[PDB]
Backbone:
RNA sequence: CUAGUACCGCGAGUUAUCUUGUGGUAAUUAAAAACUACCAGGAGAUAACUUUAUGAAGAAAAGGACAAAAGCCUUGCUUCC
């Protein structure tokens, strides 16, 4: 039951969503479409840039029930860019799906968030046996 | 019990742990292997430096309960460097054990931390009778 | 038991012990008291340096050995420094055994003295669960 | 009873005592030994400077005590210098004995502490009748 | 049952092992991967430098092992370099296997180790009849 | 008192972090009086680099004599620093 956003800046190359209850949080997606001559063939390349921004209150040190004592907000941001030829969209979606698993198995379930990299983490590619 | 730290940076020359609860707490172990020349014999020397760091906020003058403002924190650092030939590790451990007791006599049980030195403390060497 | 040392050089800040039978073995403790001031608080910082020195003969020809080979000697040293304010000394002692515990589980039980590092070793915090 | 101090800095001339509970409380003694000649005979004069320092917090309460209003300390210093040849040390102790009573009359029992001189106060000499 | 080693230092392109009992013994594996351009047949090349180092004491005089006399150890080194395209690795393994056969002919079975070269020994090709 | 005895010092620079806090930049103030935002900056603690004490090591490419070279030298790079 997440709060849905509404578009704010609608443009042929950029749309920004923001939450009515919390105007601070945003999610903006921008596309840059380009035509590429990779070799003896002309191809249409697209680079979609998706960024989600959230301003959250700081840790709120313990034993501080007082309401109007207010801390500043840090910067929780996530940026993603997807670059690939349009005709290879079907196989590109496989890349996006497996990219999520690699990040999740390394950061979500792993400890990459705290700042530690696990060389023995098991990550796999899109290609299957 | 105690919350176990988890490594944040790992390297064959140094490893740094940190408390996931608070990142200020730190315990870093570093090594410096060295090949040391003695009389017609070559011996492998290892010098391991171990540092434990804690940020403790103020002494918090008692009487009144703490108002919710952060106290500037001081550094409580314990640094330990152990140097010796690798092959004499068996006897160096005994030297480490008696070293712990000697410091405990001066500091854990004495008033060394307050800045006082007792020239009558009982100090026992690694060699036994 | 172990042979006690007697004080050698009683200085304003440094006292050095030494075994009467073996003058090579020493245990010197030096104190440095500093006047440090933090936010609206006056602190007495104490940095205690403790050095344990032992000169150990070489591994001694393996296989066997007589009682007249007398190999050269090599330096075994252990230095620890304890830095912090005396105002919160009682809690400063808390990480001392924790620092003792962390090094023991990493160097005594482990093989860090040889030159190895164990990124998966159990390192526990001073604070309690 | 009274909490004893421990020596801090030891020197051939000066030794400083400080209280473990209150590091600021201080009793320092410094001696300057010198040879002087008056009746074509050398005399070994000893000058002993004794200083006692305490930091009494000024009378903070004004009806209101409160948990943690902390207002600064004041200087309470007592310095005594004892001079005279060690040859007449036996009678010089009696001089110290008399000096104590004379000061006690003016200050300990009288109102010299308030800042008043009593001309008719009873003052007696070391020499007895 | 040969003694197993564990890695000493890790690097992006270098791993070394050493025996805990004897730190002198080492085994270094270093890789160098580089992009090789060919006649419009792109290839990936690797260069593996494998070094085995042993410090062995010089041979004691014949007919006497009793006397625990230590000769200064000498350096024994075996270094191997493998270069080739990763695509042709499968047949390159046969190259390595054949290389062993030729060396064993001169070195192990033969006496090329003593400094004597035999232009008669059978040297077989990698490919089969 | 002064051959000695004995006594004294332990530190460089740059950068960042924390604490203290000298001035300046403007505000309320007739005001750089004093609180505030920034900088410079005296001081104490910590971290990184050149280099100090005193620095030391790790070859793998190049040139130097030479066959374009390696082995004899240094430099690229790194380590506590």
Residues:
């Amino acid at each position: 039951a997440n709060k849905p956003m509404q578009p704010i800046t609608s443009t042929a190359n950029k749309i920004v969503w923001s939450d009515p209850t919390r105007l601070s949080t945003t999610f903006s997606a921008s596309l840059l479409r380009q035509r590429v001559k990779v070799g003896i063939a002309e191809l249409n390349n697209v680079s979609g840039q998706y960024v989600s921004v959230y301003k959250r209150p700081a840790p709120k040190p313990e034993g501080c029930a007082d309401a109007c004592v207010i801390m500043p907000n840090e910067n929780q941001s996530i940026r993603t860019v997807i670059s690939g030829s349009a005709e290879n969209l079907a196989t590109l979606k496989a890349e996006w799906e497996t990219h999520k698993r690699n990040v999740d198995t390394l950061f979500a379930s792993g400890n990459a968030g705290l700042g530690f990299l696990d060389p023995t983490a098991a990550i796999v590619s899109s290609d299957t046996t």
In short: Strands of chain B lie at 6-10, 14-18, 26-38, 41-57, 73-85, 124-128. The longest helix of chain B spans residues 89-108.
